[PDB]
Amino acid sequence: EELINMRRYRNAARKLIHHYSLNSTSSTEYKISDVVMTMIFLLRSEKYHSLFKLLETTFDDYTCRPQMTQVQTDTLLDAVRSLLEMPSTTIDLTTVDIMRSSFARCFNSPIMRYAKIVLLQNVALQRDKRTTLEELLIERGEKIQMLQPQQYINSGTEIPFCDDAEFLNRLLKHIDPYPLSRMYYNAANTMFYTTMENYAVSNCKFNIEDYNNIFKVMEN
Amino acid sequence: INMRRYRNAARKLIHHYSLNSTSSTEYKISDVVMTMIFLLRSEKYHSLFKLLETTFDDYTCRPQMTQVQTDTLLDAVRSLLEMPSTTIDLTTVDIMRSSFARCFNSPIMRYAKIVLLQNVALQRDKRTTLEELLIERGEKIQMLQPQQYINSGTEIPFCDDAEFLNRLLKHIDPYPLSRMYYNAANTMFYTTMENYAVSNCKFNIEDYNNIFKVMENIRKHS
Amino acid sequence: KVRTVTEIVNSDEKIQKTYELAEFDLKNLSSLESYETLKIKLALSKYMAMLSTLEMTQPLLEIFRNKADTRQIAAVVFSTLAFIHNRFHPLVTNFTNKMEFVVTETNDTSIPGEPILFTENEGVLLCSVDRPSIVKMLSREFDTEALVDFSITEVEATQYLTLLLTVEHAYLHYYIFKNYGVFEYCKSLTDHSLFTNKLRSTMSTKTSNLLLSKFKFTIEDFD
Amino acid sequence: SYETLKIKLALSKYMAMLSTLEMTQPLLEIFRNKADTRQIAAVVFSTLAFIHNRFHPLVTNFTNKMEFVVTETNDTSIPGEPILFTENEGVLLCSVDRPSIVKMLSREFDTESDFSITEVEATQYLTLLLTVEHAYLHYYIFKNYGVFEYCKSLTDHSLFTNKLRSTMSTKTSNLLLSKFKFTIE
């Protein structure tokens, strides 16, 4: 193209194309327009238009690619050599497949995407008012594996049988005679209310009788 | 050669860049390439293609074009977009061109380096902020009387039959309303602020974020 | 209604106490999504209800895009303001005689930022709005939904919704001004941060509408 | 009674775990914090060890091994026991609902050299130990009975309290839990 000053543009194109052999890299730098310019150069000439039209499959995997005559194939390596400088090295379908893999290492969709918002769903529970924890266990327990465990305080083996009666003495002389009953009452109240609030959150219902039996301790 | 498919793909790119489509994951390089190929093989669009080619800073030389040409080009653009229903400033398109120049000069690799920046392109601005803005505003506002008002049974219209409303309720029922907010509103608001790039007001997210700490307060007060 | 008793083995002495179901069903109701969906659905329904008395002129976007008249535009604005006010409080109104208002035509006349602008002098309360910017805002959607007897279009219902959030945002500044005069108002609208940092007094039985509690972005560039 | 004397004495000796050695005590409710798990994990672990060497007289050389996690959120909610424990191929694992512990301590309480004491403190310590007992029971049953029946007991804690008590009330006796009874109606 008049505007496209093709000589320099082809030169750059080859300067890239070489890197589709690991023998070369684009000075560790590349521009999209470089690729575009290469494709343009391919589409300016029939010998290279053939290869260009082959390479669409390299992202559209399922594209048809048929067989070719021995000469029809060697034509492509002839065009490759004509592009290339010092083509006296190995020229082969091995290099061609290296090129295909190099396109699959060039087109990896390095995203651009500009900018977008991000939203959240804070909470959710389902309408089945008497759903049960049991199935909910199935989801919950996955977090054992999903989430990182946290290391114990490796203080070394011990148990605190190390509590001789000095502070004890004045503690047991404060020993305030509080009405232990009502503290027990408050404790039980808070403890049950815990689970009541848990169920009222989770939208689940439970056997009060079974909770009673669960609590029960005294026998004989 | 499936020119048709090529176009079908290509469109979305410019569609997004021009106007902030609430679609996503538009990016791919192959799509860009096919876009360029289509433009090359579209004689009528070769003017646009050769303009968009101009992507190099030391040589930034977008040619003069007669208003005639520019209008013809915008017609072409709109038609191909199948959206004559509005027209957008050529300046927006040139800003997107500068964005594409960014992309070109950026050898972004496997890492999804989303640019995320709002477009910085613009020419001959002065740096400005709310100070300059306020100072400007007063005269430009006070120089004009408000147009008009008249009463039209103004006072406190009120609700009507709940079942009448339940009709519309049921109509509304199925839709992804929980998502609708992102699906237009928020994206459009946030993208609207290119007005700051207009006359180079340095937009800062650093207060736009305020929404976030704002929203806590309802949960604080249960 | 549920009685309970607690006892200690050493004594017959026992504590008796009762508790009431109601709060618990209340809580689960409030934790159930559909119940929550009722709120916003009712909001939109009631708003459209009020509009039903209006000379609605359903093609809302093009009505706003007309430019040939401003009476309808002004009336829509005002009515929306009243709607928000009566939302926030059950029993409110504004003096109705006249509030002659403005149309904003170009960026040079427009604030980049809050498109709805408020000013007052000599008792002349006045407001202004950039139709151009509002139109451009309305003009663009691309809901693919690929995310995870009145013929009211689902799509246009989007625009029907979207304005409300902006208008509410304005309402905030209006309230702040009306309670604290020019200086505090302008200082606050220098940087929206201050709003809630001041006005905990907003506390009320009904809430703002932005319940989907994230609106965030990549933290890169947060330099 | 002499029984109440013994009970309060037991609590008092647990007040050795209270103000335990090396333990920084910025609060008795440091669940208020979120930055450092270590202290909460430490108190939990130490309580387990104390209870274990109460319930048996001899294994002072308690194991030094554990992993822990802090449950914080409804989607991680575990209604029932706020704290959870397993052993996993010789690996002790545990999990804690800090929010639930916080709310439990939070709930207001009825009423009807120098030093001082306050009943609310004992209230907290009591509630702690009581809640720990339930987990200790499920731990104990699992510790010899297989996963199958263990999870059965998790689905219904009543079962084990109904059946496999062959360690009779004689063994139970140091479990001051039995001193308390309740009914809901």
PDB file of N, CA, C and O in Angstrom, chain D residues 42-80:
ATOM      1  N   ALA D  42      -4.484 -20.057  71.984  1.00  0.00           N
ATOM      2  CA  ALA D  42      -3.793 -20.475  73.195  1.00  0.00           C
ATOM      3  C   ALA D  42      -4.781 -20.762  74.311  1.00  0.00           C
ATOM      4  O   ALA D  42      -4.689 -21.792  74.986  1.00  0.00           O
ATOM      5  N   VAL D  43      -5.719 -19.844  74.540  1.00  0.00           N
ATOM      6  CA  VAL D  43      -6.663 -20.043  75.635  1.00  0.00           C
ATOM      7  C   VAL D  43      -7.498 -21.285  75.377  1.00  0.00           C
ATOM      8  O   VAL D  43      -7.708 -22.108  76.276  1.00  0.00           O
ATOM      9  N   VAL D  44      -7.978 -21.449  74.144  1.00  0.00           N
ATOM     10  CA  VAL D  44      -8.749 -22.643  73.813  1.00  0.00           C
ATOM     11  C   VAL D  44      -7.939 -23.890  74.145  1.00  0.00           C
ATOM     12  O   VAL D  44      -8.380 -24.760  74.907  1.00  0.00           O
ATOM     13  N   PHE D  45      -6.743 -23.985  73.567  1.00  0.00           N
ATOM     14  CA  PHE D  45      -5.898 -25.161  73.738  1.00  0.00           C
ATOM     15  C   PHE D  45      -5.649 -25.448  75.213  1.00  0.00           C
ATOM     16  O   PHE D  45      -5.753 -26.597  75.666  1.00  0.00           O
ATOM     17  N   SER D  46      -5.290 -24.415  75.974  1.00  0.00           N
ATOM     18  CA  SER D  46      -4.985 -24.605  77.384  1.00  0.00           C
ATOM     19  C   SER D  46      -6.206 -25.102  78.136  1.00  0.00           C
ATOM     20  O   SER D  46      -6.093 -25.948  79.030  1.00  0.00           O
ATOM     21  N   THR D  47      -7.382 -24.578  77.798  1.00  0.00           N
ATOM     22  CA  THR D  47      -8.601 -25.068  78.424  1.00  0.00           C
ATOM     23  C   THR D  47      -8.802 -26.545  78.127  1.00  0.00           C
ATOM     24  O   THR D  47      -9.160 -27.327  79.018  1.00  0.00           O
ATOM     25  N   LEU D  48      -8.594 -26.942  76.870  1.00  0.00           N
ATOM     26  CA  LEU D  48      -8.716 -28.355  76.526  1.00  0.00           C
ATOM     27  C   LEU D  48      -7.799 -29.194  77.399  1.00  0.00           C
ATOM     28  O   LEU D  48      -8.218 -30.205  77.973  1.00  0.00           O
ATOM     29  N   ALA D  49      -6.530 -28.800  77.484  1.00  0.00           N
ATOM     30  CA  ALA D  49      -5.563 -29.575  78.255  1.00  0.00           C
ATOM     31  C   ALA D  49      -5.975 -29.665  79.719  1.00  0.00           C
ATOM     32  O   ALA D  49      -5.921 -30.741  80.332  1.00  0.00           O
ATOM     33  N   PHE D  50      -6.340 -28.527  80.309  1.00  0.00           N
ATOM     34  CA  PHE D  50      -6.803 -28.518  81.691  1.00  0.00           C
ATOM     35  C   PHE D  50      -7.934 -29.511  81.893  1.00  0.00           C
ATOM     36  O   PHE D  50      -7.905 -30.331  82.817  1.00  0.00           O
ATOM     37  N   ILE D  51      -8.965 -29.421  81.053  1.00  0.00           N
ATOM     38  CA  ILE D  51     -10.109 -30.314  81.188  1.00  0.00           C
ATOM     39  C   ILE D  51      -9.661 -31.762  81.081  1.00  0.00           C
ATOM     40  O   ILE D  51     -10.114 -32.626  81.839  1.00  0.00           O
ATOM     41  N   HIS D  52      -8.797 -32.056  80.111  1.00  0.00           N
ATOM     42  CA  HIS D  52      -8.389 -33.436  79.881  1.00  0.00           C
ATOM     43  C   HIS D  52      -7.682 -34.005  81.102  1.00  0.00           C
ATOM     44  O   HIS D  52      -7.969 -35.130  81.534  1.00  0.00           O
ATOM     45  N   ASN D  53      -6.737 -33.252  81.666  1.00  0.00           N
ATOM     46  CA  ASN D  53      -5.999 -33.776  82.809  1.00  0.00           C
ATOM     47  C   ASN D  53      -6.778 -33.668  84.109  1.00  0.00           C
ATOM     48  O   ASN D  53      -6.366 -34.264  85.109  1.00  0.00           O
ATOM     49  N   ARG D  54      -7.878 -32.918  84.133  1.00  0.00           N
ATOM     50  CA  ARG D  54      -8.869 -33.131  85.180  1.00  0.00           C
ATOM     51  C   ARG D  54      -9.546 -34.480  85.004  1.00  0.00           C
ATOM     52  O   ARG D  54      -9.575 -35.302  85.925  1.00  0.00           O
ATOM     53  N   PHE D  55     -10.090 -34.725  83.812  1.00  0.00           N
ATOM     54  CA  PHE D  55     -10.940 -35.887  83.602  1.00  0.00           C
ATOM     55  C   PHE D  55     -10.157 -37.185  83.705  1.00  0.00           C
ATOM     56  O   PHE D  55     -10.747 -38.229  83.998  1.00  0.00           O
ATOM     57  N   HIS D  56      -8.853 -37.144  83.460  1.00  0.00           N
ATOM     58  CA  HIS D  56      -7.991 -38.282  83.726  1.00  0.00           C
ATOM     59  C   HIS D  56      -6.814 -37.835  84.578  1.00  0.00           C
ATOM     60  O   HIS D  56      -6.364 -36.690  84.470  1.00  0.00           O
ATOM     61  N   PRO D  57      -6.291 -38.716  85.430  1.00  0.00           N
ATOM     62  CA  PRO D  57      -5.346 -38.284  86.466  1.00  0.00           C
ATOM     63  C   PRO D  57      -3.869 -38.292  86.098  1.00  0.00           C
ATOM     64  O   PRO D  57      -3.063 -37.889  86.943  1.00  0.00           O
ATOM     65  N   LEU D  58      -3.463 -38.723  84.899  1.00  0.00           N
ATOM     66  CA  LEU D  58      -2.075 -39.159  84.747  1.00  0.00           C
ATOM     67  C   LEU D  58      -1.356 -38.679  83.492  1.00  0.00           C
ATOM     68  O   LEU D  58      -0.130 -38.533  83.548  1.00  0.00           O
ATOM     69  N   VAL D  59      -2.028 -38.414  82.375  1.00  0.00           N
ATOM     70  CA  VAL D  59      -1.284 -38.095  81.157  1.00  0.00           C
ATOM     71  C   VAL D  59      -0.903 -36.621  81.142  1.00  0.00           C
ATOM     72  O   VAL D  59      -1.471 -35.825  80.387  1.00  0.00           O
ATOM     73  N   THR D  60       0.081 -36.253  81.965  1.00  0.00           N
ATOM     74  CA  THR D  60       0.541 -34.870  82.001  1.00  0.00           C
ATOM     75  C   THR D  60       1.259 -34.476  80.715  1.00  0.00           C
ATOM     76  O   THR D  60       1.243 -33.303  80.329  1.00  0.00           O
ATOM     77  N   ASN D  61       1.897 -35.438  80.049  1.00  0.00           N
ATOM     78  CA  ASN D  61       2.639 -35.193  78.813  1.00  0.00           C
ATOM     79  C   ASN D  61       1.694 -35.034  77.617  1.00  0.00           C
ATOM     80  O   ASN D  61       1.723 -35.794  76.651  1.00  0.00           O
ATOM     81  N   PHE D  62       0.840 -34.016  77.695  1.00  0.00           N
ATOM     82  CA  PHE D  62      -0.167 -33.831  76.660  1.00  0.00           C
ATOM     83  C   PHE D  62       0.477 -33.514  75.314  1.00  0.00           C
ATOM     84  O   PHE D  62       1.561 -32.932  75.235  1.00  0.00           O
ATOM     85  N   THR D  63      -0.218 -33.906  74.249  1.00  0.00           N
ATOM     86  CA  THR D  63       0.274 -33.703  72.893  1.00  0.00           C
ATOM     87  C   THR D  63       0.488 -32.224  72.593  1.00  0.00           C
ATOM     88  O   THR D  63      -0.280 -31.364  73.031  1.00  0.00           O
ATOM     89  N   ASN D  64       1.544 -31.935  71.836  1.00  0.00           N
ATOM     90  CA  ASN D  64       1.836 -30.592  71.338  1.00  0.00           C
ATOM     91  C   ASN D  64       1.688 -30.609  69.819  1.00  0.00           C
ATOM     92  O   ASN D  64       2.660 -30.755  69.077  1.00  0.00           O
ATOM     93  N   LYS D  65       0.448 -30.451  69.355  1.00  0.00           N
ATOM     94  CA  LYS D  65       0.156 -30.432  67.925  1.00  0.00           C
ATOM     95  C   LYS D  65      -1.272 -29.962  67.679  1.00  0.00           C
ATOM     96  O   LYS D  65      -2.206 -30.461  68.314  1.00  0.00           O
ATOM     97  N   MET D  66      -1.461 -29.012  66.766  1.00  0.00           N
ATOM     98  CA  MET D  66      -2.808 -28.573  66.424  1.00  0.00           C
ATOM     99  C   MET D  66      -2.746 -27.649  65.214  1.00  0.00           C
ATOM    100  O   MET D  66      -1.698 -27.088  64.883  1.00  0.00           O
ATOM    101  N   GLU D  67      -3.884 -27.534  64.536  1.00  0.00           N
ATOM    102  CA  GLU D  67      -4.137 -26.494  63.555  1.00  0.00           C
ATOM    103  C   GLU D  67      -5.510 -25.906  63.839  1.00  0.00           C
ATOM    104  O   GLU D  67      -6.406 -26.603  64.319  1.00  0.00           O
ATOM    105  N   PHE D  68      -5.674 -24.622  63.540  1.00  0.00           N
ATOM    106  CA  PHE D  68      -6.895 -23.918  63.898  1.00  0.00           C
ATOM    107  C   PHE D  68      -7.332 -23.006  62.763  1.00  0.00           C
ATOM    108  O   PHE D  68      -6.534 -22.613  61.909  1.00  0.00           O
ATOM    109  N   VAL D  69      -8.623 -22.672  62.771  1.00  0.00           N
ATOM    110  CA  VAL D  69      -9.161 -21.637  61.897  1.00  0.00           C
ATOM    111  C   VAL D  69     -10.247 -20.855  62.626  1.00  0.00           C
ATOM    112  O   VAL D  69     -10.923 -21.366  63.527  1.00  0.00           O
ATOM    113  N   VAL D  70     -10.410 -19.601  62.221  1.00  0.00           N
ATOM    114  CA  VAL D  70     -11.369 -18.687  62.823  1.00  0.00           C
ATOM    115  C   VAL D  70     -12.532 -18.528  61.857  1.00  0.00           C
ATOM    116  O   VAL D  70     -12.405 -17.854  60.827  1.00  0.00           O
ATOM    117  N   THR D  71     -13.667 -19.141  62.180  1.00  0.00           N
ATOM    118  CA  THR D  71     -14.888 -18.870  61.436  1.00  0.00           C
ATOM    119  C   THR D  71     -15.428 -17.499  61.826  1.00  0.00           C
ATOM    120  O   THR D  71     -15.414 -17.121  63.001  1.00  0.00           O
ATOM    121  N   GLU D  72     -15.905 -16.748  60.831  1.00  0.00           N
ATOM    122  CA  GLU D  72     -16.300 -15.362  61.041  1.00  0.00           C
ATOM    123  C   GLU D  72     -17.655 -14.982  60.468  1.00  0.00           C
ATOM    124  O   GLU D  72     -18.175 -13.923  60.838  1.00  0.00           O
ATOM    125  N   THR D  73     -18.245 -15.789  59.592  1.00  0.00           N
ATOM    126  CA  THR D  73     -19.294 -15.306  58.707  1.00  0.00           C
ATOM    127  C   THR D  73     -20.378 -16.362  58.545  1.00  0.00           C
ATOM    128  O   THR D  73     -20.146 -17.561  58.721  1.00  0.00           O
ATOM    129  N   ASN D  74     -21.574 -15.882  58.200  1.00  0.00           N
ATOM    130  CA  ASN D  74     -22.751 -16.744  58.132  1.00  0.00           C
ATOM    131  C   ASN D  74     -22.521 -17.933  57.212  1.00  0.00           C
ATOM    132  O   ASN D  74     -22.819 -19.078  57.570  1.00  0.00           O
ATOM    133  N   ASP D  75     -21.991 -17.684  56.015  1.00  0.00           N
ATOM    134  CA  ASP D  75     -21.713 -18.781  55.098  1.00  0.00           C
ATOM    135  C   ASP D  75     -20.736 -19.786  55.691  1.00  0.00           C
ATOM    136  O   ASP D  75     -20.653 -20.915  55.198  1.00  0.00           O
ATOM    137  N   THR D  76     -19.981 -19.395  56.714  1.00  0.00           N
ATOM    138  CA  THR D  76     -19.171 -20.319  57.494  1.00  0.00           C
ATOM    139  C   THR D  76     -19.834 -20.708  58.808  1.00  0.00           C
ATOM    140  O   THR D  76     -19.213 -21.398  59.621  1.00  0.00           O
ATOM    141  N   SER D  77     -21.072 -20.277  59.036  1.00  0.00           N
ATOM    142  CA  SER D  77     -21.749 -20.563  60.293  1.00  0.00           C
ATOM    143  C   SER D  77     -21.843 -22.063  60.538  1.00  0.00           C
ATOM    144  O   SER D  77     -22.044 -22.851  59.611  1.00  0.00           O
ATOM    145  N   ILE D  78     -21.692 -22.452  61.798  1.00  0.00           N
ATOM    146  CA  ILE D  78     -21.971 -23.817  62.230  1.00  0.00           C
ATOM    147  C   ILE D  78     -22.928 -23.748  63.412  1.00  0.00           C
ATOM    148  O   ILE D  78     -22.483 -23.754  64.570  1.00  0.00           O
ATOM    149  N   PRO D  79     -24.234 -23.680  63.177  1.00  0.00           N
ATOM    150  CA  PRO D  79     -25.179 -23.687  64.296  1.00  0.00           C
ATOM    151  C   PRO D  79     -25.001 -24.934  65.145  1.00  0.00           C
ATOM    152  O   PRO D  79     -24.584 -25.988  64.662  1.00  0.00           O
ATOM    153  N   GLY D  80     -25.315 -24.797  66.428  1.00  0.00           N
ATOM    154  CA  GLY D  80     -24.904 -25.780  67.407  1.00  0.00           C
ATOM    155  C   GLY D  80     -23.595 -25.369  68.043  1.00  0.00           C
ATOM    156  O   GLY D  80     -23.387 -24.185  68.321  1.00  0.00           O
TER     157      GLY D  80
END
